[PDB]
Symmetry: D2
Subunit: 121 residues, 4 copies
Amino acid sequence: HFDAISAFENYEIEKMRDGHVVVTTKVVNSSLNYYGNAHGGYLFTLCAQISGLVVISLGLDGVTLQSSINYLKAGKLDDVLTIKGECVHQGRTTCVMDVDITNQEGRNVCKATFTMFVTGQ
Amino acid sequence: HFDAISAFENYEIEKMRDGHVVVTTKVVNSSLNYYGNAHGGYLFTLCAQISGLVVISLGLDGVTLQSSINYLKAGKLDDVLTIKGECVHQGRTTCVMDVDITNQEGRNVCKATFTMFVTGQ
Amino acid sequence: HFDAISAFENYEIEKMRDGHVVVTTKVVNSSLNYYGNAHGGYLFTLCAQISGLVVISLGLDGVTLQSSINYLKAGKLDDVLTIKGECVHQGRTTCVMDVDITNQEGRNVCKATFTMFVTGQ
Amino acid sequence: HFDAISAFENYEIEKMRDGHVVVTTKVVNSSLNYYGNAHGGYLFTLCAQISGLVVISLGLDGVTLQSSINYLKAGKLDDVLTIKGECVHQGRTTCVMDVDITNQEGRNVCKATFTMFVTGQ
């Protein structure tokens, strides 16, 4: 047995403009995996949501086609995670977003790149 | 504003044996994104959890180093998703897991590959 | 100093039809890296070329948007590599190709997934 | 029929120091694909070679475990490509390298992330 893995039970949107987004969130029990670390799916979901927010901030609608994520350092209970996303490439049908998560000590937690398909304006 | 994104509010483990895992789950409202489709992070978390289950089934402990996911077809409210994970490569220090999600119509929803780091036995 | 890294100085196309491609090639000196193993770029290029051939076999033109590759086992001088590609998903604007390389002993060398953008028919 | 795809028929190492590498190269006919653009495999090989150079610059020996690449803008015959590699994370067992290619106009051509396995020192 294991409990649900949840993301964004709390959050603060610090910045959302012109393809650049910054959101903060506190790691809580529902964020964790078996080993007491922030779940890789939780961390990914933080990144994917912020990637979507980057899309919206460009006046676009979109869907993720593909994503790659690298895990660098564990997130822990009560960490404050800063999720920074930006559009590195704005093409006609597709956008590429980089999203980076750091903890309250400025340490790198994970980095992801999203390939989004622009569906409309 | 947006509500939390959650994964495994419900599930059934069908198979978990020697590097092969099958788990089913039903898509619910907490699974969805802005547009009413299964959230990319939700789908990834389904895959990531099953990847870790594959690791455990091998009598191993481990952590995800890197993952890539491709989104093929939308997941919808009330879909039953089958999450199939396989260890396609068991190295000494790392394992590589393929995870595929199909819906109740047999349609491919997404595919991911996980690069896991074996921490212990 | 280092010499050029080259791919397809020799090859045999065994199969090319309906989204399924099989090509063989022999690892030669220009294939190798500093350590005497098949260069990761060489192996990737084998996969990317076969992904393109899968596109053509579907009566399409296309360009790669994104690719992810996992390296499983070293390729060595004089290995015969079998490169098998297939379209796992044929969407309207994009295709997803899986490409797998095995050696003459049937051992898995590397696996890659390509997200291609369909440019025309 | 198609001719071999080659990388580093010419190059200039501009910088190679403590985890940071810059290398330039000019796109030639052997660099290109069917459509006359820089081959995705050629571009990846440029990135992969520079990733390994980053590893060496850290006094390390290593092998690529996994890589992801995004293609942003076509490379063309006679372009001068600048290949910039950085170790963004030096773990104990693995390193993560970001590699970016820009052309002579400062335009972003592609970006890749490499997950390297440290074999020795």
